[PDB]
mmCIF file with all atom_site columns, C-alpha atoms and ligand atoms in Angstrom:
data_model
loop_
_atom_site.group_PDB
_atom_site.id
_atom_site.type_symbol
_atom_site.label_atom_id
_atom_site.label_alt_id
_atom_site.label_comp_id
_atom_site.label_asym_id
_atom_site.label_entity_id
_atom_site.label_seq_id
_atom_site.pdbx_PDB_ins_code
_atom_site.Cartn_x
_atom_site.Cartn_y
_atom_site.Cartn_z
_atom_site.occupancy
_atom_site.B_iso_or_equiv
_atom_site.pdbx_formal_charge
_atom_site.auth_seq_id
_atom_site.auth_comp_id
_atom_site.auth_asym_id
_atom_site.auth_atom_id
_atom_site.pdbx_PDB_model_num
ATOM   1   C  CA  . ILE A 1 1   ? -9.148  -5.101  -5.146  1.00 0.00 ? 1   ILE A CA  1
ATOM   2   C  CA  . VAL A 1 2   ? -11.172 -8.236  -5.432  1.00 0.00 ? 2   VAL A CA  1
ATOM   3   C  CA  . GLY A 1 3   ? -14.723 -9.057  -3.800  1.00 0.00 ? 3   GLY A CA  1
ATOM   4   C  CA  . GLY A 1 4   ? -14.562 -4.940  -2.220  1.00 0.00 ? 4   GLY A CA  1
ATOM   5   C  CA  . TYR A 1 5   ? -16.859 -2.234  -2.291  1.00 0.00 ? 5   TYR A CA  1
ATOM   6   C  CA  . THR A 1 6   ? -16.519 1.582   -3.968  1.00 0.00 ? 6   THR A CA  1
ATOM   7   C  CA  . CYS A 1 7   ? -14.686 3.771   -1.311  1.00 0.00 ? 7   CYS A CA  1
ATOM   8   C  CA  . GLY A 1 8   ? -16.013 7.259   -1.927  1.00 0.00 ? 8   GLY A CA  1
ATOM   9   C  CA  . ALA A 1 9   ? -14.395 10.033  -3.705  1.00 0.00 ? 9   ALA A CA  1
ATOM   10  C  CA  . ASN A 1 10  ? -11.540 11.239  -1.013  1.00 0.00 ? 10  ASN A CA  1
ATOM   11  C  CA  . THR A 1 11  ? -12.826 8.935   2.095   1.00 0.00 ? 11  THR A CA  1
ATOM   12  C  CA  . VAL A 1 12  ? -9.483  7.389   2.082   1.00 0.00 ? 12  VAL A CA  1
ATOM   13  C  CA  . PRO A 1 13  ? -7.532  10.997  1.960   1.00 0.00 ? 13  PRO A CA  1
ATOM   14  C  CA  . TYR A 1 14  ? -3.904  9.269   2.500   1.00 0.00 ? 14  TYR A CA  1
ATOM   15  C  CA  . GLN A 1 15  ? -3.998  7.204   -0.452  1.00 0.00 ? 15  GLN A CA  1
ATOM   16  C  CA  . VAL A 1 16  ? -1.524  8.048   -3.382  1.00 0.00 ? 16  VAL A CA  1
ATOM   17  C  CA  . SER A 1 17  ? -1.297  6.896   -6.814  1.00 0.00 ? 17  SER A CA  1
ATOM   18  C  CA  . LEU A 1 18  ? 2.086   6.222   -8.129  1.00 0.00 ? 18  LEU A CA  1
ATOM   19  C  CA  . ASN A 1 19  ? 2.173   7.486   -11.673 1.00 0.00 ? 19  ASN A CA  1
ATOM   20  C  CA  . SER A 1 20  ? 4.955   7.226   -14.879 1.00 0.00 ? 20  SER A CA  1
ATOM   21  C  CA  . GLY A 1 21  ? 2.417   7.939   -17.679 1.00 0.00 ? 21  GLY A CA  1
ATOM   22  C  CA  . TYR A 1 22  ? -0.373  5.427   -16.259 1.00 0.00 ? 22  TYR A CA  1
ATOM   23  C  CA  . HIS A 1 23  ? -1.326  4.310   -12.472 1.00 0.00 ? 23  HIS A CA  1
ATOM   24  C  CA  . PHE A 1 24  ? 1.301   1.453   -11.565 1.00 0.00 ? 24  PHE A CA  1
ATOM   25  C  CA  . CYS A 1 25  ? 1.014   0.830   -7.496  1.00 0.00 ? 25  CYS A CA  1
ATOM   26  C  CA  . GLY A 1 26  ? -0.366  2.649   -4.707  1.00 0.00 ? 26  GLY A CA  1
ATOM   27  C  CA  . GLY A 1 27  ? 1.367   4.282   -1.640  1.00 0.00 ? 27  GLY A CA  1
ATOM   28  C  CA  . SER A 1 28  ? 0.526   6.334   1.385   1.00 0.00 ? 28  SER A CA  1
ATOM   29  C  CA  . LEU A 1 29  ? 1.206   10.029  2.388   1.00 0.00 ? 29  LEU A CA  1
ATOM   30  C  CA  . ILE A 1 30  ? 2.911   9.994   6.001   1.00 0.00 ? 30  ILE A CA  1
ATOM   31  C  CA  . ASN A 1 31  ? 3.366   13.568  6.282   1.00 0.00 ? 31  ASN A CA  1
ATOM   32  C  CA  . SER A 1 32  ? 3.376   16.621  3.596   1.00 0.00 ? 32  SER A CA  1
ATOM   33  C  CA  . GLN A 1 33  ? 6.711   15.697  1.755   1.00 0.00 ? 33  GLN A CA  1
ATOM   34  C  CA  . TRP A 1 34  ? 7.176   12.064  2.164   1.00 0.00 ? 34  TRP A CA  1
ATOM   35  C  CA  . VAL A 1 35  ? 5.184   8.868   1.022   1.00 0.00 ? 35  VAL A CA  1
ATOM   36  C  CA  . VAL A 1 36  ? 5.448   4.821   1.558   1.00 0.00 ? 36  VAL A CA  1
ATOM   37  C  CA  . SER A 1 37  ? 5.171   2.644   -0.997  1.00 0.00 ? 37  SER A CA  1
ATOM   38  C  CA  . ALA A 1 38  ? 6.495   -1.248  -1.657  1.00 0.00 ? 38  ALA A CA  1
ATOM   39  C  CA  . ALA A 1 39  ? 9.794   -1.552  -2.662  1.00 0.00 ? 39  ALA A CA  1
ATOM   40  C  CA  . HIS A 1 40  ? 8.634   -4.200  -5.669  1.00 0.00 ? 40  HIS A CA  1
ATOM   41  C  CA  . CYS A 1 41  ? 7.324   -0.942  -7.085  1.00 0.00 ? 41  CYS A CA  1
ATOM   42  C  CA  . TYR A 1 42  ? 10.373  1.363   -7.836  1.00 0.00 ? 42  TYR A CA  1
ATOM   43  C  CA  . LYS A 1 43  ? 10.886  3.043   -10.886 1.00 0.00 ? 43  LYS A CA  1
ATOM   44  C  CA  . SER A 1 44  ? 12.734  6.533   -11.908 1.00 0.00 ? 44  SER A CA  1
ATOM   45  C  CA  . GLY A 1 45  ? 10.441  9.214   -13.178 1.00 0.00 ? 45  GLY A CA  1
ATOM   46  C  CA  . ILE A 1 46  ? 7.499   8.799   -10.486 1.00 0.00 ? 46  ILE A CA  1
ATOM   47  C  CA  . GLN A 1 47  ? 4.971   11.414  -10.107 1.00 0.00 ? 47  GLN A CA  1
ATOM   48  C  CA  . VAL A 1 48  ? 2.894   11.351  -7.021  1.00 0.00 ? 48  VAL A CA  1
ATOM   49  C  CA  . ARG A 1 49  ? -0.913  11.527  -7.539  1.00 0.00 ? 49  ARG A CA  1
ATOM   50  C  CA  . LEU A 1 50  ? -2.684  13.060  -4.573  1.00 0.00 ? 50  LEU A CA  1
ATOM   51  C  CA  . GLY A 1 51  ? -6.565  13.560  -3.662  1.00 0.00 ? 51  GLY A CA  1
ATOM   52  C  CA  . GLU A 1 52  ? -7.530  10.913  -6.512  1.00 0.00 ? 52  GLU A CA  1
ATOM   53  C  CA  . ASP A 1 53  ? -10.846 8.919   -6.577  1.00 0.00 ? 53  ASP A CA  1
ATOM   54  C  CA  . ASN A 1 54  ? -11.159 8.580   -10.613 1.00 0.00 ? 54  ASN A CA  1
ATOM   55  C  CA  . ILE A 1 55  ? -7.977  8.151   -11.980 1.00 0.00 ? 55  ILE A CA  1
ATOM   56  C  CA  . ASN A 1 56  ? -8.723  8.891   -15.451 1.00 0.00 ? 56  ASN A CA  1
ATOM   57  C  CA  . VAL A 1 57  ? -10.622 11.984  -14.860 1.00 0.00 ? 57  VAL A CA  1
ATOM   58  C  CA  . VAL A 1 58  ? -9.483  15.455  -13.306 1.00 0.00 ? 58  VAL A CA  1
ATOM   59  C  CA  . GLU A 1 59  ? -12.396 15.772  -10.376 1.00 0.00 ? 59  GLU A CA  1
ATOM   60  C  CA  . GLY A 1 60  ? -10.669 18.923  -8.686  1.00 0.00 ? 60  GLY A CA  1
ATOM   61  C  CA  . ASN A 1 61  ? -9.367  17.699  -5.406  1.00 0.00 ? 61  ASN A CA  1
ATOM   62  C  CA  . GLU A 1 62  ? -6.081  16.399  -7.176  1.00 0.00 ? 62  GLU A CA  1
ATOM   63  C  CA  . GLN A 1 63  ? -2.809  17.655  -6.692  1.00 0.00 ? 63  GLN A CA  1
ATOM   64  C  CA  . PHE A 1 64  ? 0.382   16.154  -8.669  1.00 0.00 ? 64  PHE A CA  1
ATOM   65  C  CA  . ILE A 1 65  ? 3.863   16.684  -7.382  1.00 0.00 ? 65  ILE A CA  1
ATOM   66  C  CA  . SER A 1 66  ? 7.288   14.718  -9.043  1.00 0.00 ? 66  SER A CA  1
ATOM   67  C  CA  . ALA A 1 67  ? 9.102   12.768  -6.804  1.00 0.00 ? 67  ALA A CA  1
ATOM   68  C  CA  . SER A 1 68  ? 12.450  14.357  -5.561  1.00 0.00 ? 68  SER A CA  1
ATOM   69  C  CA  . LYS A 1 69  ? 14.126  11.075  -4.632  1.00 0.00 ? 69  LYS A CA  1
ATOM   70  C  CA  . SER A 1 70  ? 13.596  7.217   -4.023  1.00 0.00 ? 70  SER A CA  1
ATOM   71  C  CA  . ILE A 1 71  ? 14.965  5.491   -1.222  1.00 0.00 ? 71  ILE A CA  1
ATOM   72  C  CA  . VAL A 1 72  ? 14.640  1.571   -0.980  1.00 0.00 ? 72  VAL A CA  1
ATOM   73  C  CA  . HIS A 1 73  ? 15.044  -0.215  1.921   1.00 0.00 ? 73  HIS A CA  1
ATOM   74  C  CA  . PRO A 1 74  ? 18.544  -0.951  2.354   1.00 0.00 ? 74  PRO A CA  1
ATOM   75  C  CA  . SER A 1 75  ? 17.732  -5.049  2.984   1.00 0.00 ? 75  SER A CA  1
ATOM   76  C  CA  . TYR A 1 76  ? 15.333  -5.402  0.331   1.00 0.00 ? 76  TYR A CA  1
ATOM   77  C  CA  . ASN A 1 77  ? 15.436  -8.787  -1.446  1.00 0.00 ? 77  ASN A CA  1
ATOM   78  C  CA  . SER A 1 78  ? 13.532  -8.993  -4.769  1.00 0.00 ? 78  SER A CA  1
ATOM   79  C  CA  . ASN A 1 79  ? 13.639  -12.531 -4.727  1.00 0.00 ? 79  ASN A CA  1
ATOM   80  C  CA  . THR A 1 80  ? 12.000  -13.174 -1.310  1.00 0.00 ? 80  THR A CA  1
ATOM   81  C  CA  . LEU A 1 81  ? 10.018  -9.666  -1.023  1.00 0.00 ? 81  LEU A CA  1
ATOM   82  C  CA  . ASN A 1 82  ? 11.591  -9.431  2.227   1.00 0.00 ? 82  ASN A CA  1
ATOM   83  C  CA  . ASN A 1 83  ? 11.509  -5.728  3.491   1.00 0.00 ? 83  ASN A CA  1
ATOM   84  C  CA  . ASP A 1 84  ? 9.542   -4.670  0.654   1.00 0.00 ? 84  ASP A CA  1
ATOM   85  C  CA  . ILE A 1 85  ? 9.120   -0.870  1.764   1.00 0.00 ? 85  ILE A CA  1
ATOM   86  C  CA  . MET A 1 86  ? 10.408  2.226   -0.068  1.00 0.00 ? 86  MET A CA  1
ATOM   87  C  CA  . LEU A 1 87  ? 10.030  5.900   0.503   1.00 0.00 ? 87  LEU A CA  1
ATOM   88  C  CA  . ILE A 1 88  ? 9.469   8.629   -1.662  1.00 0.00 ? 88  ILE A CA  1
ATOM   89  C  CA  . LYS A 1 89  ? 10.178  12.202  -1.202  1.00 0.00 ? 89  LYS A CA  1
ATOM   90  C  CA  . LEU A 1 90  ? 8.235   15.109  -2.698  1.00 0.00 ? 90  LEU A CA  1
ATOM   91  C  CA  . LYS A 1 91  ? 9.423   17.832  -4.814  1.00 0.00 ? 91  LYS A CA  1
ATOM   92  C  CA  . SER A 1 92  ? 7.325   20.096  -2.893  1.00 0.00 ? 92  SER A CA  1
ATOM   93  C  CA  . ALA A 1 93  ? 5.150   19.797  0.071   1.00 0.00 ? 93  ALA A CA  1
ATOM   94  C  CA  . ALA A 1 94  ? 1.406   18.695  -0.339  1.00 0.00 ? 94  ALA A CA  1
ATOM   95  C  CA  . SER A 1 95  ? -1.492  21.191  0.703   1.00 0.00 ? 95  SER A CA  1
ATOM   96  C  CA  . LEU A 1 96  ? -2.994  18.986  3.191   1.00 0.00 ? 96  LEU A CA  1
ATOM   97  C  CA  . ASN A 1 97  ? -7.046  19.461  3.811   1.00 0.00 ? 97  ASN A CA  1
ATOM   98  C  CA  . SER A 1 98  ? -10.123 17.138  4.710   1.00 0.00 ? 98  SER A CA  1
ATOM   99  C  CA  . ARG A 1 99  ? -9.364  15.219  1.537   1.00 0.00 ? 99  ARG A CA  1
ATOM   100 C  CA  . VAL A 1 100 ? -5.743  14.868  1.146   1.00 0.00 ? 100 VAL A CA  1
ATOM   101 C  CA  . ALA A 1 101 ? -4.491  14.079  4.981   1.00 0.00 ? 101 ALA A CA  1
ATOM   102 C  CA  . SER A 1 102 ? -1.437  12.302  6.141   1.00 0.00 ? 102 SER A CA  1
ATOM   103 C  CA  . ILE A 1 103 ? -1.734  8.697   7.871   1.00 0.00 ? 103 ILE A CA  1
ATOM   104 C  CA  . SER A 1 104 ? -0.167  7.970   11.170  1.00 0.00 ? 104 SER A CA  1
ATOM   105 C  CA  . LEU A 1 105 ? 2.646   5.500   11.481  1.00 0.00 ? 105 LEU A CA  1
ATOM   106 C  CA  . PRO A 1 106 ? 2.357   3.185   14.361  1.00 0.00 ? 106 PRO A CA  1
ATOM   107 C  CA  . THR A 1 107 ? 3.810   2.623   17.817  1.00 0.00 ? 107 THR A CA  1
ATOM   108 C  CA  . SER A 1 108 ? 2.682   -0.753  18.348  1.00 0.00 ? 108 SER A CA  1
ATOM   109 C  CA  . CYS A 1 109 ? 2.411   -3.664  15.611  1.00 0.00 ? 109 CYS A CA  1
ATOM   110 C  CA  . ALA A 1 110 ? -1.139  -4.936  15.394  1.00 0.00 ? 110 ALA A CA  1
ATOM   111 C  CA  . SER A 1 111 ? -2.842  -8.388  16.273  1.00 0.00 ? 111 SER A CA  1
ATOM   112 C  CA  . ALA A 1 112 ? -4.086  -10.879 14.466  1.00 0.00 ? 112 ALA A CA  1
ATOM   113 C  CA  . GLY A 1 113 ? -8.056  -10.584 14.792  1.00 0.00 ? 113 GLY A CA  1
ATOM   114 C  CA  . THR A 1 114 ? -7.592  -6.581  14.207  1.00 0.00 ? 114 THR A CA  1
ATOM   115 C  CA  . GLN A 1 115 ? -10.067 -5.397  11.282  1.00 0.00 ? 115 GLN A CA  1
ATOM   116 C  CA  . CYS A 1 116 ? -8.078  -3.622  9.061   1.00 0.00 ? 116 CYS A CA  1
ATOM   117 C  CA  . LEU A 1 117 ? -8.954  -1.125  5.643   1.00 0.00 ? 117 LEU A CA  1
ATOM   118 C  CA  . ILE A 1 118 ? -7.208  -1.971  2.648   1.00 0.00 ? 118 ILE A CA  1
ATOM   119 C  CA  . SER A 1 119 ? -7.361  0.342   -0.650  1.00 0.00 ? 119 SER A CA  1
ATOM   120 C  CA  . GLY A 1 120 ? -6.265  0.509   -4.128  1.00 0.00 ? 120 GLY A CA  1
ATOM   121 C  CA  . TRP A 1 121 ? -7.489  0.599   -8.165  1.00 0.00 ? 121 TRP A CA  1
ATOM   122 C  CA  . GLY A 1 122 ? -5.867  -2.812  -8.497  1.00 0.00 ? 122 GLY A CA  1
ATOM   123 C  CA  . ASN A 1 123 ? -7.859  -5.760  -10.439 1.00 0.00 ? 123 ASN A CA  1
ATOM   124 C  CA  . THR A 1 124 ? -11.101 -6.690  -9.503  1.00 0.00 ? 124 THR A CA  1
ATOM   125 C  CA  . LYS A 1 125 ? -11.242 -10.192 -10.489 1.00 0.00 ? 125 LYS A CA  1
ATOM   126 C  CA  . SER A 1 126 ? -9.592  -13.408 -9.835  1.00 0.00 ? 126 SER A CA  1
ATOM   127 C  CA  . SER A 1 127 ? -9.972  -14.760 -12.841 1.00 0.00 ? 127 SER A CA  1
ATOM   128 C  CA  . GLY A 1 128 ? -9.486  -12.506 -15.854 1.00 0.00 ? 128 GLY A CA  1
ATOM   129 C  CA  . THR A 1 129 ? -8.749  -8.706  -15.209 1.00 0.00 ? 129 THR A CA  1
ATOM   130 C  CA  . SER A 1 130 ? -10.536 -5.699  -14.625 1.00 0.00 ? 130 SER A CA  1
ATOM   131 C  CA  . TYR A 1 131 ? -8.962  -2.340  -13.486 1.00 0.00 ? 131 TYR A CA  1
ATOM   132 C  CA  . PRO A 1 132 ? -11.632 0.033   -11.635 1.00 0.00 ? 132 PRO A CA  1
ATOM   133 C  CA  . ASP A 1 133 ? -11.438 3.824   -12.534 1.00 0.00 ? 133 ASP A CA  1
ATOM   134 C  CA  . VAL A 1 134 ? -12.416 4.596   -9.091  1.00 0.00 ? 134 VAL A CA  1
ATOM   135 C  CA  . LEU A 1 135 ? -10.761 3.796   -5.825  1.00 0.00 ? 135 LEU A CA  1
ATOM   136 C  CA  . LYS A 1 136 ? -11.850 0.248   -3.948  1.00 0.00 ? 136 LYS A CA  1
ATOM   137 C  CA  . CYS A 1 137 ? -11.786 -0.841  -0.288  1.00 0.00 ? 137 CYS A CA  1
ATOM   138 C  CA  . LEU A 1 138 ? -11.781 -3.423  1.495   1.00 0.00 ? 138 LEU A CA  1
ATOM   139 C  CA  . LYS A 1 139 ? -12.037 -4.771  5.394   1.00 0.00 ? 139 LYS A CA  1
ATOM   140 C  CA  . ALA A 1 140 ? -10.167 -7.311  6.246   1.00 0.00 ? 140 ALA A CA  1
ATOM   141 C  CA  . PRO A 1 141 ? -8.736  -9.011  9.329   1.00 0.00 ? 141 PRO A CA  1
ATOM   142 C  CA  . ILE A 1 142 ? -4.928  -9.861  10.109  1.00 0.00 ? 142 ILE A CA  1
ATOM   143 C  CA  . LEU A 1 143 ? -4.426  -13.341 10.307  1.00 0.00 ? 143 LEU A CA  1
ATOM   144 C  CA  . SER A 1 144 ? -2.268  -15.315 12.758  1.00 0.00 ? 144 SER A CA  1
ATOM   145 C  CA  . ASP A 1 145 ? 1.297   -15.766 12.279  1.00 0.00 ? 145 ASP A CA  1
ATOM   146 C  CA  . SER A 1 146 ? 0.716   -19.752 11.949  1.00 0.00 ? 146 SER A CA  1
ATOM   147 C  CA  . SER A 1 147 ? -2.062  -19.684 9.544   1.00 0.00 ? 147 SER A CA  1
ATOM   148 C  CA  . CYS A 1 148 ? -0.109  -17.544 7.755   1.00 0.00 ? 148 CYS A CA  1
ATOM   149 C  CA  . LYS A 1 149 ? 3.070   -19.521 7.613   1.00 0.00 ? 149 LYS A CA  1
ATOM   150 C  CA  . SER A 1 150 ? 0.628   -22.698 7.017   1.00 0.00 ? 150 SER A CA  1
ATOM   151 C  CA  . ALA A 1 151 ? -0.640  -20.896 3.993   1.00 0.00 ? 151 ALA A CA  1
ATOM   152 C  CA  . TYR A 1 152 ? 3.292   -20.506 2.458   1.00 0.00 ? 152 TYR A CA  1
ATOM   153 C  CA  . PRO A 1 153 ? 5.557   -22.687 4.235   1.00 0.00 ? 153 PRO A CA  1
ATOM   154 C  CA  . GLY A 1 154 ? 9.068   -21.300 4.061   1.00 0.00 ? 154 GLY A CA  1
ATOM   155 C  CA  . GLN A 1 155 ? 7.781   -17.776 2.798   1.00 0.00 ? 155 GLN A CA  1
ATOM   156 C  CA  . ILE A 1 156 ? 7.034   -16.043 5.703   1.00 0.00 ? 156 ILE A CA  1
ATOM   157 C  CA  . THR A 1 157 ? 9.102   -13.686 7.203   1.00 0.00 ? 157 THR A CA  1
ATOM   158 C  CA  . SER A 1 158 ? 9.102   -11.745 10.417  1.00 0.00 ? 158 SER A CA  1
ATOM   159 C  CA  . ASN A 1 159 ? 8.725   -8.495  8.428   1.00 0.00 ? 159 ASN A CA  1
ATOM   160 C  CA  . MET A 1 160 ? 5.643   -9.966  6.965   1.00 0.00 ? 160 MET A CA  1
ATOM   161 C  CA  . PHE A 1 161 ? 1.656   -10.463 7.832   1.00 0.00 ? 161 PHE A CA  1
ATOM   162 C  CA  . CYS A 1 162 ? -0.947  -12.234 6.300   1.00 0.00 ? 162 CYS A CA  1
ATOM   163 C  CA  . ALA A 1 163 ? -4.513  -10.467 5.968   1.00 0.00 ? 163 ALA A CA  1
ATOM   164 C  CA  . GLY A 1 164 ? -7.548  -11.621 4.790   1.00 0.00 ? 164 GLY A CA  1
ATOM   165 C  CA  . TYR A 1 165 ? -9.907  -14.727 4.407   1.00 0.00 ? 165 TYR A CA  1
ATOM   166 C  CA  . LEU A 1 166 ? -9.171  -18.126 4.085   1.00 0.00 ? 166 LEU A CA  1
ATOM   167 C  CA  . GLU A 1 167 ? -12.075 -19.430 2.088   1.00 0.00 ? 167 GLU A CA  1
ATOM   168 C  CA  . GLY A 1 168 ? -11.387 -16.606 -0.425  1.00 0.00 ? 168 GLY A CA  1
ATOM   169 C  CA  . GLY A 1 169 ? -13.443 -13.917 -2.676  1.00 0.00 ? 169 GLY A CA  1
ATOM   170 C  CA  . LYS A 1 170 ? -11.773 -11.285 -1.119  1.00 0.00 ? 170 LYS A CA  1
ATOM   171 C  CA  . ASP A 1 171 ? -8.248  -9.716  -1.254  1.00 0.00 ? 171 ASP A CA  1
ATOM   172 C  CA  . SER A 1 172 ? -6.174  -7.367  -2.848  1.00 0.00 ? 172 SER A CA  1
ATOM   173 C  CA  . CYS A 1 173 ? -4.540  -7.817  -6.063  1.00 0.00 ? 173 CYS A CA  1
ATOM   174 C  CA  . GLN A 1 174 ? -2.222  -6.698  -9.177  1.00 0.00 ? 174 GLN A CA  1
ATOM   175 C  CA  . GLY A 1 175 ? -2.078  -2.853  -9.137  1.00 0.00 ? 175 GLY A CA  1
ATOM   176 C  CA  . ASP A 1 176 ? -3.002  -2.671  -5.137  1.00 0.00 ? 176 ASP A CA  1
ATOM   177 C  CA  . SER A 1 177 ? 0.751   -3.213  -4.544  1.00 0.00 ? 177 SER A CA  1
ATOM   178 C  CA  . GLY A 1 178 ? 2.373   -0.353  -2.057  1.00 0.00 ? 178 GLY A CA  1
ATOM   179 C  CA  . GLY A 1 179 ? -1.279  0.787   -1.284  1.00 0.00 ? 179 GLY A CA  1
ATOM   180 C  CA  . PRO A 1 180 ? -2.420  0.914   2.663   1.00 0.00 ? 180 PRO A CA  1
ATOM   181 C  CA  . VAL A 1 181 ? -3.619  -1.477  5.240   1.00 0.00 ? 181 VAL A CA  1
ATOM   182 C  CA  . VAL A 1 182 ? -4.707  0.826   7.829   1.00 0.00 ? 182 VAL A CA  1
ATOM   183 C  CA  . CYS A 1 183 ? -5.498  -0.533  11.531  1.00 0.00 ? 183 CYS A CA  1
ATOM   184 C  CA  . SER A 1 184 ? -7.518  1.587   14.101  1.00 0.00 ? 184 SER A CA  1
ATOM   185 C  CA  . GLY A 1 185 ? -6.418  4.990   12.323  1.00 0.00 ? 185 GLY A CA  1
ATOM   186 C  CA  . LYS A 1 186 ? -2.596  3.441   11.957  1.00 0.00 ? 186 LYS A CA  1
ATOM   187 C  CA  . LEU A 1 187 ? -0.499  2.359   8.817   1.00 0.00 ? 187 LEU A CA  1
ATOM   188 C  CA  . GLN A 1 188 ? 0.046   -1.223  10.101  1.00 0.00 ? 188 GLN A CA  1
ATOM   189 C  CA  . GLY A 1 189 ? 0.967   -2.768  6.435   1.00 0.00 ? 189 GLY A CA  1
ATOM   190 C  CA  . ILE A 1 190 ? 1.925   -2.081  2.515   1.00 0.00 ? 190 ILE A CA  1
ATOM   191 C  CA  . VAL A 1 191 ? 0.195   -4.119  0.001   1.00 0.00 ? 191 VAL A CA  1
ATOM   192 C  CA  . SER A 1 192 ? 3.129   -6.577  -1.033  1.00 0.00 ? 192 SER A CA  1
ATOM   193 C  CA  . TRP A 1 193 ? 2.438   -10.117 -2.495  1.00 0.00 ? 193 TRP A CA  1
ATOM   194 C  CA  . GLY A 1 194 ? 0.211   -13.191 -3.123  1.00 0.00 ? 194 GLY A CA  1
ATOM   195 C  CA  . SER A 1 195 ? -0.702  -16.346 -4.812  1.00 0.00 ? 195 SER A CA  1
ATOM   196 C  CA  . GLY A 1 196 ? -2.998  -14.891 -7.322  1.00 0.00 ? 196 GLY A CA  1
ATOM   197 C  CA  . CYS A 1 197 ? -5.761  -13.009 -5.888  1.00 0.00 ? 197 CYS A CA  1
ATOM   198 C  CA  . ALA A 1 198 ? -9.031  -14.145 -3.236  1.00 0.00 ? 198 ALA A CA  1
ATOM   199 C  CA  . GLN A 1 199 ? -7.947  -17.700 -3.934  1.00 0.00 ? 199 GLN A CA  1
ATOM   200 C  CA  . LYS A 1 200 ? -8.754  -20.140 -1.228  1.00 0.00 ? 200 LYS A CA  1
ATOM   201 C  CA  . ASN A 1 201 ? -5.928  -20.793 1.475   1.00 0.00 ? 201 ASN A CA  1
ATOM   202 C  CA  . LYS A 1 202 ? -4.112  -17.970 -0.180  1.00 0.00 ? 202 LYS A CA  1
ATOM   203 C  CA  . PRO A 1 203 ? -4.446  -14.642 1.419   1.00 0.00 ? 203 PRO A CA  1
ATOM   204 C  CA  . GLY A 1 204 ? -2.587  -11.462 1.123   1.00 0.00 ? 204 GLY A CA  1
ATOM   205 C  CA  . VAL A 1 205 ? 0.981   -10.739 2.211   1.00 0.00 ? 205 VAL A CA  1
ATOM   206 C  CA  . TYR A 1 206 ? 1.495   -7.336  3.736   1.00 0.00 ? 206 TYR A CA  1
ATOM   207 C  CA  . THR A 1 207 ? 4.848   -5.966  4.715   1.00 0.00 ? 207 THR A CA  1
ATOM   208 C  CA  . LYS A 1 208 ? 4.655   -5.525  8.915   1.00 0.00 ? 208 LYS A CA  1
ATOM   209 C  CA  . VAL A 1 209 ? 5.082   -1.451  9.184   1.00 0.00 ? 209 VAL A CA  1
ATOM   210 C  CA  . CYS A 1 210 ? 5.857   -1.287  12.912  1.00 0.00 ? 210 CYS A CA  1
ATOM   211 C  CA  . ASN A 1 211 ? 9.134   -3.042  12.170  1.00 0.00 ? 211 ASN A CA  1
ATOM   212 C  CA  . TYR A 1 212 ? 10.353  -0.334  10.239  1.00 0.00 ? 212 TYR A CA  1
ATOM   213 C  CA  . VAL A 1 213 ? 9.174   2.854   12.106  1.00 0.00 ? 213 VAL A CA  1
ATOM   214 C  CA  . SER A 1 214 ? 12.702  3.406   13.501  1.00 0.00 ? 214 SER A CA  1
ATOM   215 C  CA  . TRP A 1 215 ? 14.005  3.177   9.786   1.00 0.00 ? 215 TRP A CA  1
ATOM   216 C  CA  . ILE A 1 216 ? 11.602  5.443   8.429   1.00 0.00 ? 216 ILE A CA  1
ATOM   217 C  CA  . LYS A 1 217 ? 11.961  8.374   11.068  1.00 0.00 ? 217 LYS A CA  1
ATOM   218 C  CA  . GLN A 1 218 ? 15.862  8.113   10.878  1.00 0.00 ? 218 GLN A CA  1
ATOM   219 C  CA  . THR A 1 219 ? 15.287  8.655   7.128   1.00 0.00 ? 219 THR A CA  1
ATOM   220 C  CA  . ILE A 1 220 ? 12.945  11.124  6.849   1.00 0.00 ? 220 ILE A CA  1
ATOM   221 C  CA  . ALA A 1 221 ? 14.985  13.211  9.716   1.00 0.00 ? 221 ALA A CA  1
ATOM   222 C  CA  . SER A 1 222 ? 18.066  13.460  7.184   1.00 0.00 ? 222 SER A CA  1
ATOM   223 C  CA  . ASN A 1 223 ? 16.911  13.625  3.867   1.00 0.00 ? 223 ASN A CA  1
HETATM 224 N  N1  . NCA B 2 .   ? -3.219  -11.767 -3.520  1.00 0.00 ? 1   NCA B N1  1
HETATM 225 C  C1  . NCA B 2 .   ? -2.615  -10.523 -3.001  1.00 0.00 ? 1   NCA B C1  1
HETATM 226 O  O1  . NCA B 2 .   ? -3.274  -9.676  -2.278  1.00 0.00 ? 1   NCA B O1  1
HETATM 227 C  C2  . NCA B 2 .   ? -1.637  -9.836  -4.324  1.00 0.00 ? 1   NCA B C2  1
HETATM 228 C  C3  . NCA B 2 .   ? -1.263  -8.442  -3.965  1.00 0.00 ? 1   NCA B C3  1
HETATM 229 C  C4  . NCA B 2 .   ? -0.673  -7.787  -4.656  1.00 0.00 ? 1   NCA B C4  1
HETATM 230 C  C5  . NCA B 2 .   ? -0.103  -8.616  -6.030  1.00 0.00 ? 1   NCA B C5  1
HETATM 231 N  N2  . NCA B 2 .   ? -0.397  -9.682  -6.024  1.00 0.00 ? 1   NCA B N2  1
HETATM 232 C  C6  . NCA B 2 .   ? -1.162  -10.166 -5.522  1.00 0.00 ? 1   NCA B C6  1
HETATM 233 CA CA1 . CA  B 3 .   ? -8.776  12.268  -11.143 1.00 0.00 ? 2   CA  B CA1 1
#
């Protein structure tokens, strides 16, 4: 996250870190045994880390649980990033409390104008690299589809939305991928892609979660 703020320990209780010996992507806990993240984050051998603030220090509220199954969306296209969403089932159910909690799926799509919270342990610089050890947060509005499409001609599908600032300076970035975009207490987006980070006229692009609720529910019910 570029241009954000330190969230505070366990203030974003649904945020997870995907670990393969190191943090590589974010995710969101949607129930005691399932996590949603971006398909481009797919890897074998994932350990899901819940209850994290500092990812390099054991602070006392962590739960580390191995994934038992990963399901990439059936129509994921790695070249266009269309349908950038995947589900991860945990080997065992997480213990749910004030600091480890699920986030609700939306029943309606959010509108441009709506303010959302984006979070992650990704790069904090637009030029150069600095990875934080503690969770960073950013409040950003959903942008109109027209401004989104104008910023990225020929690249925005019906399964994506833009959020952020056209002036720049504030955005998600590498390492935040797979993480949550939460608006009005619902999961509306997944950190997906963006041309550099926090660049003028190049806002972040997020997977539209409201288009996938039926898929998510059906998949969970049978796996
Ligand atoms: N610019 C961005 O928001 C972004 C997000 C994820 C990966 N790369 C860039
Ligand atoms: Ca920790």
